[model samples]
Target: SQKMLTQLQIDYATNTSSNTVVAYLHNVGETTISYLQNSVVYFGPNGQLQPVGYNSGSSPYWTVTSNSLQPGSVVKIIIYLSSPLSSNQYYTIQIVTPNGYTVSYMF
Candidate 1:
C-alpha cells in the first residue's frame, strides 16, 4: 500500500486509581505501526480533557506491551497520570499516535 495505513483500536480500559489506568489496544490495520511510546493520552471529562504524555517526558508516563504494533495483535498499556482523575466523575482515555491514528476508551 502506498499510503501509510495506521489503523488501531482501543479494546478496553480500566481506571485503577485517581492517578493510574490500564488499557488494552489492538492493531487491526494491514500494516505495522510504530511510535506508541510517544502516544499522548487525553483523559478527564467529556468536554474537558487533559493531555497525558507517554513513556517520554511525563510523570504521566505509560508502560506499553509493544512499541511496534503489529496487525491483529492486542497489547496492554498502563498509564500513570501526572494528576488525579476523580473516579466518581465520568472520564475518557484517548490515545493519539504521532501518525494521527487514534483510539479511545471511557469510564
Candidate 2:
C-alpha cells in the first residue's frame, strides 16, 4: 500500500520594512517530512521568481540544517525579497515536498 506523507499547513507573514517573508510550515501527518528534500520558491512582482535560500546560521529565516521534521513539528522559513513590496502586489509562494506533490499559496 502507498503511504501518504504530504500533509502540511503553511502560514505567511511579511515585514516590508525588513524585506522579509516568513512562512510557517507545520507537519500535520503521521510520517516525517524531509526538510532537505523540500524546495520553496517565491514569485514576486514584475513576473520574477526566486528560490528561498536555506540557512542554518543565526538567522530568523527557515533553514533546513537538520534531517527531517517529525510529526507535529513546525518549521518557520524567512525569505528576503530583493525589491520593496507594494500595495496590490500579489506574491505566490510554492512549496514542493519530497513526495513530488507541489502546493502553492498566494499573498
Candidate 3:
C-alpha cells in the first residue's frame, strides 16, 4: 500500500539577522504531519550544513512557532546558528520531517 501524503512548501525564509534565521512552511499534502520532536533542522553556510536539534539551549538549535502542522497549514520555525551572518553570504536551511520529506530554503 502507498504511504500517506506528506509534503511541504516553503513560503519564505529570512537570514537578515545575526546568527538567526526564521522560516515559514506549509503542508500542502493531505496528511497531518506529526512527530515534530523527531524532525531535524539543518542550518549553515552554503554547500555544507549542520544538523540541529529540537532545542538544546545552545548556539545551534531549532524551534517551531506552532503546536502542530496540518494540511494547507502554515508553520514558522526559528533557527539559531553558531556563526554570525555576513552580507551577501549564501546560506541554506532545511527542515526534515519524520515521515521522510525535506523542505529547503536558500538565502
Candidate 4:
C-alpha cells in the first residue's frame, strides 16, 4: 500500500481594517510552480474567505505570500491548528489564479 500525503484547508481571520491576522501553514509541497502569484484561502468553519498576499512575477513559488493581502480584496487564506480542531474540523480552500483558473483543496 502507498502512503498518501494529503493537504489541509486553513481558517483565517481578518480585521475590519486593512491589516489582517497571520496564517500558519505546514507540510507544504516541495515542487513549486511559476506564473502563480497570490491565492485565496477559504475555511469551512465560518464559510468565509481571506486573502493570502504575495509578490509579482513568480520565480519563488506557486503559492501566495503574506503581504499580498490587502483590504477589500475579498480573498481567502490558510491557517494552522494550534490546538486540536473542534468536531473533526473539516474545511476547504480555493485558489484563483490571475488567468482565472480556480483550484480547491478539501480536508
Error of 3 at 46 (Å): 2.0
Worst 10 residues of 4 by lDDT: 1-10
Q: Which pairs clash inside model 4?
A: 41-76, 41-77, 50-75, 50-76, 53-65, 53-68, 53-69, 54-68
Residue 87 Cα positional deviation in candidate 2, in Å, after optimal superposition: 1.6
Stretches of candidate 3 off by over 4 Å are 1-4
Best of the two (1, 3) by lDDT: 3
Error of 3 at 91 (Å): 0.7
Residues 1-107 of candidate 1: C-alpha lDDT, one tens digit per residue: 31357678888888777777888888888877676677777776755777766666666677886777778988888878777776568878787776777778777
Checking candidate 1 for backbone clashes, the offending pairs are none
Q: Largest lDDT belongs to which candidate?
A: 3
TM-score computed on alpha carbons, candidate 2: 0.69
Q: Candidate 1 — what's its lDDT?
A: 0.76
Model 2, which residues run further than 4 Å from truth? 1-4, 46-48, 53-66
Give all candidate RMSDs, comma-separated. Answer: 2.6, 4.0, 2.0, 12.1
Per residue, candidate 3 scores C-alpha lDDT tens digits across 35-101 of 7667888887766888887888987898886666788898778888788886667888877787778
Give the Cα lDDT of each candidate: 0.76, 0.60, 0.78, 0.36
Top model number, TM-score? 3
What lDDT score is found at residue 18 in candidate 3?
A: 78
Model 1's number of clashes is 0
Which residue ranges in model 1 land beyond 4 Å of their true spot?
1-5, 56-58, 82-84
Q: Which residue pairs of candidate 3 clash?
A: none
